[PDB]
Amino acid sequence: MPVLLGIPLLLRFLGFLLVTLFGYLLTFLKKGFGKIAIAISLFLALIIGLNSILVG
Amino acid sequence: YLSDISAQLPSDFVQGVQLILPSNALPCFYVILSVKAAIFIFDVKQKIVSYLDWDK
């Protein structure tokens, strides 16, 4: 299906930006699931900590 | 506030207290004052870990 000389490269580029940008969203998602790991850890560590004082 | 509402036990009501007091009496009182402090540090530190949900 005949096309001009530059259209096939505009169509390949408009799906490079999309995969790059959808690649960044993934990186940031994974980071925010690491915050909920730090948070949980902290809480349970403060509980185990108080126990050791009171029983002493 | 606690500086001008201050009073001390008269000196005649000592011979009494020092006939009835066990050895673990005053040591126990101090515990009731240390358990309080501990819970205040737990509370403040538990509210700083909840600020990790302000960035979402």
Swiss-Prot record, chain B:
Membrane topology: Multi-pass membrane protein
Transmembrane residue ranges: 24-44
Keyword Electron transport set for record: no
One of the protein's GO biological processes: symbiont entry into host cell
Domain of life: Viruses
GO cellular component assignments: host cell membrane; membrane; virion component
Subunit structure: Interacts with G3P; this interaction is required for proper integration of G3P and G6P into the virion.
UniProt function note: Plays essential roles both in the entry of the viral genome into the bacterial host and in budding process. The formation of the G3P-G6P complex termed adsorption complex is essential for correct termination of filamentous phage assembly.
Family stated for the protein in its record: Belongs to the inovirus G6P protein family.
Name of the protein this chain belongs to: Head virion protein G6P
Lineage of producing organism: Viruses, Monodnaviria, Loebvirae, Hofneiviricota, Faserviricetes
Gene designation: VI
Full-length numbering of the shown residues: 57 to 112 of 112
